[PDB]
Design a binder for this molecule. Sequence first.
Ligand code: HEM
Length: 154
Amino acid sequence: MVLSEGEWQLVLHVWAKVEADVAGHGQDILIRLFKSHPETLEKFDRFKHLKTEAEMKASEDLKKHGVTVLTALGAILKKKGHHEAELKPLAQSHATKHKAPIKYLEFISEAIIHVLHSRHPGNFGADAQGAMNKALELFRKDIAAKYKELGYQG
Ligand code: HEM
């Protein structure tokens, strides 16, 4: 698929606001994922012991991982579709080591959209949400194709 320039501008305009507080957004997104879809927590040996939202919010480790996650995603989005090199090591680790199914990438996608909608209503109207959804769908499609080349699931 291909996004237009005007779609990429909508994506990077809201992402510029996210980047004012990467750690806070990273925490909100992972906590949303883990509360919405508790099954995903089981993939993280590092975090699986966390019982409550309160425990998640107080974890320095979870916050650090949120920063890692959003920094990797932010680098991919700023490539505006030209992200083949950034995607390769990410696909390899998530297919072979972490075993992160496409369905769980859908779930974190939903979590990202929820948090941007909650925190940035003025810059995340319907057209901006549509552009962010397309960017994330593009990401998932390209990662699924690499999963296939690497010998993991769809
Ligand atoms: C926007 C989607 C995601 C991005 C950009 C992302 C990014 C990253 C990065 C950069 C790392 C560290 C380096 C590496 O191991 O590749 C990592 C590790 C990891 N990811 Fe993801 N990830 C995403 C989605 C997921 C999902 C949905 C799952 C599983 C439900 C997952 C499970 C893991 C695990 C288990 C680790 C290792 C954590 C640890 O023990 O240090 N990832 N991810």
